[PDB]
Design a protein around this ligand. Sequence first.
Ligand SMILES: NC(=O)c1ccc[n+]([C@@H]2O[C@H](COP(=O)([O-])OP(=O)(O)OC[C@H]3O[C@@H](n4cnc5c(N)ncnc54)[C@H](O)[C@@H]3O)[C@@H](O)[C@H]2O)c1
Ligand SMILES: NC(=O)c1ccc[n+]([C@@H]2O[C@H](COP(=O)([O-])OP(=O)(O)OC[C@H]3O[C@@H](n4cnc5c(N)ncnc54)[C@H](O)[C@@H]3O)[C@@H](O)[C@H]2O)c1
Ligand SMILES: O=c1ccn([C@@H]2O[C@H](COP(=O)(O)OP(=O)(O)O)[C@@H](O)[C@H]2O)c(=O)[nH]1
Ligand SMILES: O=c1ccn([C@@H]2O[C@H](COP(=O)(O)OP(=O)(O)O)[C@@H](O)[C@H]2O)c(=O)[nH]1
Ligand code: NA
Ligand code: NA
Ligand code: NA
Ligand code: NA
Lengths: 338, 338
Amino acid sequence: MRVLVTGGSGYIGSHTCVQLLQNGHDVIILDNLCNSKRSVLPVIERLGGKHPTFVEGDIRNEALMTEILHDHAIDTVIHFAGLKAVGESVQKPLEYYDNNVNGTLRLISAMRAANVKNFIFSSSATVYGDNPKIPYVESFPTGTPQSPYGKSKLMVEQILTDLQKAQPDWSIALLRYFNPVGAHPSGDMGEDPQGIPNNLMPYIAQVAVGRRDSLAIFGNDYPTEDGTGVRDYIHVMDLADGHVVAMEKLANKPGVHIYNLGAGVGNSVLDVVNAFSKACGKPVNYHFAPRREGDLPAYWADASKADRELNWRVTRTLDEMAQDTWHWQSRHPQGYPD
Amino acid sequence: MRVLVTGGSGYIGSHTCVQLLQNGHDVIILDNLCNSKRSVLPVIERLGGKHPTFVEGDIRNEALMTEILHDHAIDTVIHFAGLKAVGESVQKPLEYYDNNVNGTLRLISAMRAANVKNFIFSSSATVYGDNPKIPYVESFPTGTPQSPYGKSKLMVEQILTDLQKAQPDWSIALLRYFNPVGAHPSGDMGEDPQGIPNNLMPYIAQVAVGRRDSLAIFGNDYPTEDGTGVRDYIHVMDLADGHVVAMEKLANKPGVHIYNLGAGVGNSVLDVVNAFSKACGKPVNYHFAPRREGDLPAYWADASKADRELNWRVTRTLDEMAQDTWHWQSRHPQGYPD
Ligand SMILES: NC(=O)c1ccc[n+]([C@@H]2O[C@H](COP(=O)([O-])OP(=O)(O)OC[C@H]3O[C@@H](n4cnc5c(N)ncnc54)[C@H](O)[C@@H]3O)[C@@H](O)[C@H]2O)c1
Ligand SMILES: NC(=O)c1ccc[n+]([C@@H]2O[C@H](COP(=O)([O-])OP(=O)(O)OC[C@H]3O[C@@H](n4cnc5c(N)ncnc54)[C@H](O)[C@@H]3O)[C@@H](O)[C@H]2O)c1
Ligand SMILES: O=c1ccn([C@@H]2O[C@H](COP(=O)(O)OP(=O)(O)O)[C@@H](O)[C@H]2O)c(=O)[nH]1
Ligand SMILES: O=c1ccn([C@@H]2O[C@H](COP(=O)(O)OP(=O)(O)O)[C@@H](O)[C@H]2O)c(=O)[nH]1
Ligand code: NA
Ligand code: NA
Ligand code: NA
Ligand code: NA
């Protein structure tokens, strides 16, 4: 099929585009380059073994969206474009609501004008909010997200939901995930944070590489097996796969299809650090700090539904996530070239 | 002070502008005329005894908002502009999210660029969602609104809340109200629905006037004194007053100030009908229907906080709401002139 991939040049999107091309689909990437570089493009092509069209632009530009949609006879849209730095979200709320909330609204509005009715949304497991019932299941009602980032994701979910109700021919997937990590096995694509990495893995990778001194472990007091925070980590390649399957299997199947994408088990901070020490061949330096603002002791996704309904499940291990990361970090220390 | 009143030519806004002018404030009205007519303008001036500047335009146009803000040296903004038809909201969700969510975001963004930090938001008591704890108190956490309309209001509240947190110098009021009714005592301004009136009072007024056959009373089965739905009705003049006070008393007082605006008591459907039969001098025709989609047996606002903190409370009665309505309906059967 003909797919428009917003945010396609970013971390998850790039990986997804390669898998898409490999499946022989026609790929149109829409990205504003606010958090990615044109240099990834040729890598996508190479790895994908096919040429994806690239359009520089913003989801907030409804006019352009409609043009693109029409110009390329788009059948489906996988939407990864947006802002995702939780801490930044607290400091710059408006920017998050605009890019995420308004950004998606402008996009779906254009789809409406262009008669495109298949959509796959990059959601987030932060929508579950404060849930003492873990792991999280899709049948669980959502809660109230802690940050402007989380709130914007639920807001979008709600909007798409009402939309589908008003325009029942629409097929919409809400893909909820936690912590994506790893990189393409080639070691030639991966996560390329500009500045202080947000997530654990990359941060740790930076500590490993020499860039950082020590990892601060926020809380060693939790009601967990080792006292540190337990989270769900999913390999980026598996995530990308889940995206392709969802897109192929749900196209033209009316409704709001909610699926948690994850390994179905949790891992502590120490578990992640040990995995990494192992992958990079040297002890990762860390120290303990006291509980970070807004964090919970432990949570993960129940991914039975996707297994059952989409026949999808993870295949990569925590160790591979680490190795893959180390590999990319190692082959391309300066990330993507400017 | 210099105040920008978005949606100022509509029902509540017009009333509010008159009270504003009377208080000697400088009023700039911003309206897109999607639900009001230029003809109300001269009435505003007359009743207000002062000239308000009028600008035709849309809140979604950030550029214009900023211009306006700067051009007039705005000190505070009272925001009534938006869409509010609940049933229409279910049928046309996008339009509601755009006008309400995006609409406010564009407006506050402009304020940001123009260095305007005092805001009064026309909120809604639908934000309380499904609350079996009545009456509703501001200390109660919000729930999940039933319609796209309700959801958009809570979304806006959430956005303004995070904003204030990131820009602590801002003063923001969230004014939660239920069912505004009545009209200016002059009988020369009032609610002018185009088409099938949404709310009870006006609908009933139309039945009275001859336009409608009978009022359908959705449910006579409720756990209420008379079996019909109990709601909170607030006279439009009192609402307008609450708006002025909030604006004058909260300007430059940092924080998110939440206040329920209401009478503090509930009235059933039959109560409203009887009140109206009485005001128009003739039995209002009605019949019973079974429970409308999404409605609850009874709810109202606890307005102690406003009384205490703002020294504000209603002064008009249900009977006046009815009389005033009948009066306007009677002096101007064709509403505002085109
Ligand atoms: N990265 C994560 O850890 C994570 C976790 C949960 C959910 N998600 C969701 O996945 C999506 C992308 O995540 P990611 O990890 O690939 O991050 P990313 O920054 O690498 O990729 C997003 C891409 O979108 C682009 N973009 C941002 N705003 C845009 C706009 N207004 N118009 C056009 N392009 C725009 C950026 O330039 C970047 O290339 C977002 O929906 C995010 O909320 C990601
Ligand atoms: N009317 C009610 O029953 C009610 C109940 C609860 C909350 N509220 C809130 O009060 C506000 C106004 O209520 P109202 O009763 O006066 O209705 P209204 O339609 O009479 O007034 C709103 C006005 O806003 C204008 N407008 C709408 N969208 C606009 C946009 N995008 N840009 C510029 N102007 C725009 C319309 O032309 C109209 O003049 C809204 O915030 C509504 O949610 C109203
Ligand atoms: O410098 C860091 C970054 C992350 N974490 C922990 O690593 C886990 C994964 O968090 P991250 O921010 O990567 O994602 P989250 O699970 O909050 O999305 C959480 O328990 C964080 O508490 C940590 O201790 N130090
Ligand atoms: O044609 C109508 C319109 C309204 N109502 C009732 O009048 C009350 C006020 O409802 P409205 O739509 O005016 O506002 P709500 O309280 O739902 O905002 C509610 O119990 C409605 O059930 C009714 O029975 N028939
Ligand atoms: Na419909
Ligand atoms: Na670099
Ligand atoms: Na801050
Ligand atoms: Na008329």
